[PDB]
Amino acid sequence: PMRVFAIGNPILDLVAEVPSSFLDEFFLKRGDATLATPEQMRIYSTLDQFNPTSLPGGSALNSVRVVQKLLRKPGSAGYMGAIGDDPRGQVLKELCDKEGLATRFMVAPGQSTGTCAVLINEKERTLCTHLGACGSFRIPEDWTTFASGALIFYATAYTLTATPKNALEVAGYAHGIPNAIFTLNLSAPFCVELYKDAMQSLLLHTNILFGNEEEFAHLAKVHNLVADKTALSTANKEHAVEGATKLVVMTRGHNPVIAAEQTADGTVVVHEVGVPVVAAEKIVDTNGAGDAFVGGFLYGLSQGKTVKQCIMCGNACAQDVIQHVGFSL
């Protein structure tokens, strides 16, 4: 059952399909995902009537899903995340429920909930988000009991956005025993650049480094150096120390994924797996598919493990993910 634990911001999605105008009413433009402002708050209610089949998710959330469905069993994945005393959450728990998820979401007093109006076109989406009724997770002191037995720990770097205590206090315990695993996902340029001093420690208490070129480069620019794939991949991994050892998955968009295993005698190997993705316009989902990669990676991770295997697995996670709607499981 429980064999993967995720910690992040529980966020809800409101995929719909709004005529251009609806869209223009809330000055959003097509091919945009941004942080909702004051006039875009009354929007949730709006798209809360249409015909929007809203699903649960986020980053750690979507990533887990995978993992979760990848399994098929109930409570095989738990996740902790801040929710508010809001019906946007009340549905955020029963919905995450039916999926066979064991997430624990504390409720944020008068904090309200948080979703992301996911306007579209015939496929082309525009998302408006409100990440703040989700930023007040203070890992419960007994959270280790709730995840008690789990050996695969995860959480999105976003987590820092509130306070790096949680994702801080998760790999510190995780490090205690029993031979579990800590994986962190670079998240955005903000997390990376707008975080530093926290990641330096997190980094070390990190067994798995998940991310793409974009920030690995904004991460590389954060540490003493220069430079490429092997460049940053092994240069970013090149930090100190501590088959679940010290990974760093350098997803190069389409270009081959690029990593490296760290073999007991301390010998650095570099894992390189392209990405046979045969598809058309049925792409577009830069997140939801990188959230997928992390999914198979932590699924096939709880099931045998294997360098290219796990990395070559999330491939058909995103591939199959970036395909269907915003995280259509």
From Swiss-Prot:
Comment on bound cofactor: Binds 1 Mg(2+) ion per subunit.
Disulfide bonds: none
GO biological process: AMP salvage; purine nucleobase metabolic process; purine ribonucleoside salvage
UniProt keyword terms in alphabetical order: ATP-binding, Kinase, Magnesium, Metal-binding, Nucleotide-binding, Purine salvage, Transferase
Names of required cofactors: Mg(2+)
Family matches, as Gene3D superfamilies: 3.30.1110.10, 3.40.1190.20
EC number of this enzyme: 2.7.1.20
Entry binding sites for Mg(2+): A174, I177, A180
Reaction(s) catalysed (UniProt annotation): adenosine + ATP = AMP + ADP + H(+)
Any one cellular-component term (Gene Ontology): nucleus
Pathway noted in the entry: Purine metabolism; AMP biosynthesis via salvage pathway; AMP from adenosine: step 1/1
GO MF annotation terms: adenosine kinase activity; ATP binding; metal ion binding
InterPro entries: Adenokinase, Carboh/pur_kinase_PfkB_CS, PfkB_dom, Ribokinase-like
Pfam families: PfkB
CDD domains for this protein: adenosine_kinase (cd01168)
Positions of the catalytic residues: D291
Function (record text): ATP-dependent phosphorylation of adenosine and other related nucleoside analogs to monophosphate derivatives. It is a key purine metabolic enzyme in the opportunistic parasitic protozoan toxoplasma gondii as it cannot synthesize purines de novo.
Annotated PANTHER family: ADENOSINE KINASE
Name of the protein described by the UniProt record: Adenosine kinase
Gene behind the chain: AK
